Amino acid sequence: GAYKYLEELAKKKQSDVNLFLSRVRAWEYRQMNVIHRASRPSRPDKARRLGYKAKQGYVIYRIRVRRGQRSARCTAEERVGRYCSNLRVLNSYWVNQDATYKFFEVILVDPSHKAIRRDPRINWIVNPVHKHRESRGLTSIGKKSRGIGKGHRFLRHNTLSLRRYR
Amino acid sequence: YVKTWFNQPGRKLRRRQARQTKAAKIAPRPVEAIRPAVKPPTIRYNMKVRAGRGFTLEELKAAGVSRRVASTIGIPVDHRRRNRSEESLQRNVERIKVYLAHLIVFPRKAGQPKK
Amino acid sequence: WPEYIRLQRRRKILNLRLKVPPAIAQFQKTLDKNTATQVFKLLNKYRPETAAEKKQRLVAEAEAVANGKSAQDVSKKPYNVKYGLNHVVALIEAKKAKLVLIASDVDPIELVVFLPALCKKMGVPYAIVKNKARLGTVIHQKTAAVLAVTEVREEDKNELASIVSAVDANFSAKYDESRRKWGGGI
Amino acid sequence: LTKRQLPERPSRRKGHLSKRTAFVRSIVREVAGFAPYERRVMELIRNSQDKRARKLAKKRLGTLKRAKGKIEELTSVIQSSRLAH
Amino acid sequence: YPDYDDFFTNTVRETPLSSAPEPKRRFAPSKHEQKRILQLAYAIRKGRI
Amino acid sequence: LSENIQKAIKEMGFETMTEIQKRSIPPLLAGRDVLGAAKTGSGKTLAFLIPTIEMLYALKFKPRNGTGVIIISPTRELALQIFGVAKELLKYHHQTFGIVIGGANRRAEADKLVKGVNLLVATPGRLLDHLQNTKGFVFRNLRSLVIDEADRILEIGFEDEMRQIMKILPSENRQTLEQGYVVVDSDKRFLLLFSFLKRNLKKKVIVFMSSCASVKYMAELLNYIDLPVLDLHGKQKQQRRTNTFFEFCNAEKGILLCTNVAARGLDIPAVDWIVQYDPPDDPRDYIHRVGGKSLMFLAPSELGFLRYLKTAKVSLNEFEFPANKVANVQSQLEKLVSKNYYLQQSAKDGYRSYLQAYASYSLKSIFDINKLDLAKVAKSFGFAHPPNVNI
Amino acid sequence: LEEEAVKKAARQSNKMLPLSAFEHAYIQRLINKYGTEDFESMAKDVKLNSKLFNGSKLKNLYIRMKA
RNA sequence: UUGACCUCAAAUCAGGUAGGACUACGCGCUGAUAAGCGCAGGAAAAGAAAAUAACCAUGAUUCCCUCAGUAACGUGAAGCGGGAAAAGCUCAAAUUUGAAAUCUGGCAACAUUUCUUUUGUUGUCCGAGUUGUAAUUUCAA
RNA sequence: AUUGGAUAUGCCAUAUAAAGCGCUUUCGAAGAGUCGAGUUGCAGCUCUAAAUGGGUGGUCAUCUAA
């Protein structure tokens, strides 16, 4: 399909084509609001890979963040999640940057929509345990931030364990 | 900041109850599935044998149980462990082949459309 | 002026005042008026069946089966234009397509920016036509991105060999240096 | 003990390029062009400032393994552009 | 601002690219329709269509 | 011999052992190593595998006991002739028996060897990738590594492979064992044949191909384009193959389609026309097979064989025919190869092997795979864009 | 528990499949054109193998044809 | 003049949705663990290896005992072993191309209920969707 | 009275279908401003990859992240 070509093209981020669209879209993204809704994902492959199916209930937002100390991508998950109080966050990826702003998008899912609720691949997020996932550090970059992985890299002693018989 | 063990007689019984409530549903079939015999990996314990996680994909093929009909009849599978030597493989076929010899699966009614 | 219009004329002009790379430069030089009226005349026979009247022929197919008759034994292999971006990339890589049509207004331009390069490599004659919606009208859609003829019947093969020769001779034979130099900066 | 030869895991074949992926990269290598340091290197690999060329890739990429892979990457471009142009 | 280096796509590749063989479901009646017909045909016997 | 192998041999159509087989089957069944030196078509295929299949059967080996034997073959045309009899003999047996040749899927041929194939018919190149590169392919449970065509394997160019590869595998406690020309283009290769097969419809015609699959595809298209003919290979079934050669030789007029590998040793009758639609690979055997008329379509970029036969003191004449008389029916051959699912799968698996014969061409300077035209060699077969073949 | 697990699998043991009206006639049309043995060439039949069935699948129905 | 499409708006439009309280226990944020801020459930976090090991190898996660006050540098682990419980998997990336096979919604019938309060099926008309909704597959392949 | 998973049995089903495993002369796609290096308090800033590659451990072993 087209997503094979669109993954390898999205990696050559500094080349002439990927740089020309960077200057152009950073212009349009900057005159828009700080948080403004998309209608299509700018990167329709990265969004497709990170979970976004193109059906009703999947909402793409995009938000600039000031550079220069919580990780910027994490706050783009939180600030959009405080602007949409109903939508459930799935992911948030990088689409553009400049000398003063990083641009991201976010994949958001309506838990009340009776199209998410009838679909058994995304029905895990209707459950109430997933309320404000981006708050609890429970998502793609909130897991990497807090060192939740598998590896030697990444009160349990501070209490004395006084058994009955000792 | 302590860890007091006054519930220790109670977790024993709660585990005992919830191990009997597990058996209520599974009344004719065991409360836990058969685990293989795998040798511990250190120089210290490599002469011991103990239960592991599950039967490999070629311990199970060699015994006649496919990977799909495996977890129905209560046989754990380990898609990670591999049989490096025959002895690791011949010991665990005789875990399955005794288990299949001692197990009786109740049959079921099918859904063939008629007429 | 409203809050958004003064953007709507400025992103029109910043595509002009900047340096367009040669990959994107060819996406404004476009197939003309004339030769873009016969391509869609050939395609207007090979439209996909409208989803309402595919069902209409399916209830007329499923009523005779409920009595004993059939038509599957005598059903000849269908025809239509082939659309969708992911289905047409695989129709070019397999050298099955014979005329690829690229819209000139896909909003993220990376979606089709590899197609005039892929059509040049796989030897599939190509042309960039206007108005993605114009393709969308062909296949009963809102916005199409690309189309492709892979097989017309024996009726229009002689027409197709002529209309492609208009596509190379006007798009590919011309436009040969504007695709090889930067654009914009007007 | 009586050791077996095991077959290979089907996951150890990650890192092997197919013929379809290598055709994807070759197309997108040119249609995306060259970055605003990789234009600089192609000039220095053309007029043979080789020790100067390898000095920049190490400073920009970080590691010789990458700084050697580009050489091998970009030198294939010029030796194929002399037959195109 | 150089010209366009079409060092690779200059020529034409003559072969197809994907080598997996043509499946059999492109040479027979569309078996998705044949399932779809039987849903409509069944619906006539129940008298809903 | 065992009754299960004898009844299969009875079904195979072989009862009387060859004279060379009379001096070999007695010693080979007893385990005596024999330095085989026999002529082409002298029963070297059936006799050598007869005691080898029983030797593993006497061991009563299951599929997991490893590769208990090996039969080295020097050519892809010979390997399909070797594994074909192997697939016909051990049908009443239990273990696995397959082939490993050059120019195949090196991961769908290794995946066959991870389970454990008893009689793995091998090429001199792919077997060197088994013992060294592939992991999980155990050959250390073997009994005999049979070898064939010592004079041909040494001339293949891999004369250092047979000694290097044998240094790793198990050896101890195991025994070892006037011409007619038609200068045609790459495009109108079978176009002259399709015209000749229609013009000479009432004469004794024998058409030779360089691959078993080459006969297994053009014979189906001939019968689909209303031009029936008999094949001397069939579906690798020796029952009909024995009847086909009996019927074709008894027939005074007809078209005989056969591979040159199986044609060696068969009773070649007086054919009015003898055709080789593909180039020959054996330089000495094909010249000796001539001694009606015989003419083979010579390729445009393959005049080396004409320069080789002339250097071999053999006459050659180019009997011509006007190009306007050549039928331009290569448009319906692009529609038939597009519609039929089985004719295409033969025309894709026919051109796949018929290109590897140009890869394993013994005449390296004359027939070069990298010096021919890839485009026109498909429009003769019927495919517009030549199919995706792994080299 | 042995008895309940054998008599239940004694009446629920027969898995013969009678063909449909079409499935009977589809094989019926095929078998009257080439006979009852040469199933392997029916994957090369152009018209009556309109479903492009296997060489094996036709024998699967042929067992279901008789029994 | 007219018509699509993109973008942006407006509506006491149709139907929904978010705040706030408890905070013993959970997870984050900064922080002299305390305080402050944020966010859930009956548990939560964790989770089916980009893990250990150097063996005749182990095999998601959690928890207890031990390793052990040990290695390492007053602070202070982890592998192994012994227990409790054990359940696995789902997408992206290959063309359904002999047929968008997918789904929300409006209306109407048929049911159905912890329930006249609930939850669905079928018919039908837009609409979403080819910038990709289903079938297939997740490397154990 | 509401409710559980079952057992037998009645009616429906639509199966022109779907699934397990042999057998392969065929193919086998794998997540980036991420990894990584430099550098300030796992974050910030500068720079920016590859396909038997990449990661962590002793030429080997073991894993398959974004």
Coordinates of C-alpha atoms (C1' of nucleotides) in Angstrom, one line a residue, chain H:
Chain H
rU1 C1' -25.9 32.0 -14.3
rU2 C1' -25.3 26.7 -11.9
rG3 C1' -22.8 22.3 -9.5
rA4 C1' -19.6 19.6 -6.8
rC5 C1' -15.3 19.4 -3.1
rC6 C1' -12.1 21.5 0.9
rU7 C1' -12.0 24.6 5.0
rC8 C1' -14.5 27.5 8.5
rA9 C1' -18.7 29.0 11.1
rA10 C1' -24.1 29.4 13.3
rA11 C1' -28.4 26.8 15.6
rU12 C1' -32.7 26.7 23.1
rC13 C1' -31.2 21.7 16.1
rA14 C1' -31.3 15.6 17.2
rG15 C1' -28.9 12.5 20.8
rG16 C1' -24.9 12.3 24.2
rU17 C1' -21.0 13.7 27.3
rA18 C1' -17.3 16.7 31.6
rG19 C1' -16.7 19.0 36.2
rG20 C1' -18.2 18.0 42.1
rA21 C1' -17.7 14.6 47.0
rC22 C1' -15.1 10.4 49.7
rU23 C1' -9.3 9.7 48.8
rA24 C1' -7.6 3.7 54.0
rC25 C1' -5.5 1.3 49.9
rG26 C1' -3.6 2.8 43.7
rC27 C1' -0.9 5.8 39.8
rG28 C1' 1.4 10.3 38.4
rC29 C1' 3.5 15.9 39.4
rU30 C1' 6.8 18.9 41.5
rG31 C1' 8.6 18.5 46.7
rA32 C1' 11.2 20.9 52.3
rU33 C1' 9.1 10.6 53.1
rA34 C1' 5.6 15.3 55.3
rA35 C1' 2.7 19.3 52.9
rG36 C1' 0.6 21.1 48.1
rC37 C1' -1.5 19.7 42.6
rG38 C1' -3.8 16.1 39.5
rC39 C1' -6.5 11.1 38.4
rA40 C1' -9.3 6.0 38.9
rG41 C1' -11.2 1.2 40.9
rG42 C1' -13.2 -2.7 43.9
rA43 C1' -8.9 -3.2 43.8
rA44 C1' -5.4 -0.4 41.2
rA45 C1' -0.4 -0.3 39.1
rA46 C1' 2.3 -4.6 36.4
rG47 C1' 2.1 -8.0 32.3
rA48 C1' 2.8 -11.9 28.0
rA49 C1' 10.7 -10.2 27.3
rA50 C1' 14.4 -5.2 22.6
rA51 C1' 14.3 -10.8 30.3
rU52 C1' 17.9 -13.5 32.8
rA53 C1' 21.7 -16.6 32.4
rA54 C1' 26.9 -19.0 31.0
rC55 C1' 23.7 -24.1 32.9
rC56 C1' 22.2 -30.8 31.4
rA57 C1' 19.6 -23.9 31.0
rU58 C1' 15.4 -20.9 32.9
rG59 C1' 10.4 -18.4 30.7
rA60 C1' 4.5 -12.7 31.1
rU61 C1' 3.1 -9.9 35.6
rU62 C1' 2.1 -9.8 41.0
rC63 C1' 3.1 -11.2 46.1
rC64 C1' 5.4 -13.8 50.4
rC65 C1' 10.2 -16.5 52.3
rU66 C1' 15.1 -16.8 51.0
rC67 C1' 19.2 -14.9 48.4
rA68 C1' 21.0 -10.8 52.7
rG69 C1' 22.4 -7.1 55.6
rU70 C1' 25.2 -10.3 50.9
rA71 C1' 27.5 -8.3 46.3
rA72 C1' 28.4 -3.0 44.9
rC73 C1' 29.4 2.0 47.0
rG74 C1' 26.0 4.8 56.6
rU75 C1' 23.2 3.4 52.4
rG76 C1' 22.1 -1.2 50.0
rA77 C1' 20.3 -4.8 45.5
rA78 C1' 19.4 -8.4 41.7
rG79 C1' 19.8 -13.7 39.2
rC80 C1' 19.0 -18.8 41.1
rG81 C1' 16.0 -21.7 44.5
rG82 C1' 11.1 -22.4 47.7
rG83 C1' 5.7 -20.9 47.7
rA84 C1' 0.6 -18.6 46.3
rA85 C1' -1.9 -17.8 41.4
rA86 C1' -1.2 -19.1 36.6
rA87 C1' -4.6 -17.1 30.6
rG88 C1' -3.3 -15.5 27.1
rC89 C1' -3.4 -12.3 23.3
rU90 C1' -5.1 -7.8 19.8
rC91 C1' -3.4 -4.1 15.8
rA92 C1' 0.3 -1.4 12.0
rA93 C1' 3.2 -3.4 8.1
rA94 C1' 1.0 -8.0 1.8
rU95 C1' -4.7 -6.2 -3.2
rU96 C1' -11.4 -7.9 -0.5
rU97 C1' -9.9 -5.9 -6.3
rG98 C1' -14.1 -11.7 -9.3
rA99 C1' -17.2 -6.5 -7.0
rA100 C1' -16.8 -1.6 1.1
rA101 C1' -17.8 -8.0 2.1
rU102 C1' -17.7 -2.7 7.3
rC103 C1' -20.3 0.9 10.7
rU104 C1' -23.1 5.2 13.2
rG105 C1' -27.6 7.6 12.6
rG106 C1' -33.5 8.6 11.1
rC107 C1' -38.1 6.0 10.4
rA108 C1' -41.2 1.5 10.9
rA109 C1' -42.2 -3.4 12.5
rC110 C1' -40.7 -7.7 15.9
rA111 C1' -39.3 -8.9 20.3
rU112 C1' -37.1 -8.6 25.0
rU113 C1' -36.4 -7.2 30.3
rU114 C1' -33.7 -6.9 37.4
rC115 C1' -37.2 -3.0 34.3
rU116 C1' -43.9 -0.7 31.0
rU117 C1' -37.6 2.2 33.6
rU118 C1' -33.7 -2.7 30.2
rU119 C1' -31.3 -4.6 25.9
rG120 C1' -31.5 -6.1 20.9
rU121 C1' -33.0 -8.2 15.8
rU122 C1' -35.0 -7.4 11.0
rG123 C1' -36.8 -4.1 7.0
rU124 C1' -35.9 0.8 4.9
rC125 C1' -33.6 6.0 3.9
rC126 C1' -29.6 9.2 4.3
rG127 C1' -24.7 9.5 6.3
rA128 C1' -19.5 7.7 7.7
rG129 C1' -15.7 5.2 4.7
rU130 C1' -11.3 4.0 -0.8
rU131 C1' -6.5 10.0 2.8
rG132 C1' -9.2 2.4 4.0
rU133 C1' -14.3 0.3 7.3
rA134 C1' -14.6 -5.7 7.5
rA135 C1' -12.3 -11.1 6.4
rU136 C1' -6.9 -12.7 7.0
rU137 C1' -1.9 -12.4 10.1
rU138 C1' 1.2 -10.6 14.8
rC139 C1' 7.2 -13.6 14.3
rA140 C1' 5.2 -18.7 19.1
rA141 C1' 4.8 -17.2 13.4

